[PDB]
Amino acid sequence: MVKDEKSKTLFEVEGAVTALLPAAEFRVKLDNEHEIICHVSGKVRRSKIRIIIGDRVLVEMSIYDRNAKKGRIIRRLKGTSDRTISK
């Protein structure tokens, strides 16, 4: 509803979670040595995705304000491995 028509202006970061908090919070570290906050706020609720430490994550957040402090963490998407790898 609120995250539907607006906040489409969104930036996507590829990183990995560093630690989780008892607030269902997943804080990830960018390869540029930057730790950012992430929470579940997307299709993750409907699709039911399992976030685990040690795996890569896709951080979908907006640079403005609403999704500025925290991003939408789901999991590492398919890394376009359909190119060849012996097809």
Side-chain angles (χ1 to χ4, degrees):
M1 186 279 180
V2 61
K3 310 293 181 177
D4 184 290
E5 190 65 87
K6 292 170 175 172
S7 300
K8 292 177 181 163
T9 49
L10 180 144
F11 188 78
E12 305 159 274
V13 179
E14 298 175 73
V17 60
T18 192
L20 78 169
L21 281 70
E25 181 174 278
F26 301 100
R27 301 168 86 124
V28 307
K29 74 279 177 170
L30 181 66
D31 290 304
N32 194 80
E33 190 188 88
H34 230 148
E35 318 78 56
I36 55 177
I37 302 175
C38 302
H39 262 111
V40 289
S41 299
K43 190 187 65 178
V44 189
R45 197 287 184 209
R46 293 292 176 121
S47 189
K48 298 191 180 189
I49 306 298
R50 182 184 178 192
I51 298 78
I52 63 287
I53 304 178
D55 194 79
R56 285 296 201 175
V57 299
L58 181 64
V59 183
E60 308 176 281
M61 82 294 180
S62 179
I63 308 300
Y64 300 126
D65 176 79
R66 45 273 258 118
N67 296 34
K69 307 85 182 186
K70 45 70 168 60
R72 298 160 55 229
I73 180 178
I74 170 177
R75 197 233 158 164
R76 174 61 182 169
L77 69 165
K78 276 57 71 70
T80 48
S81 37
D82 66 301
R83 309 175 196 170
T84 163
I85 61 176
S86 299
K87 189 184 68 183

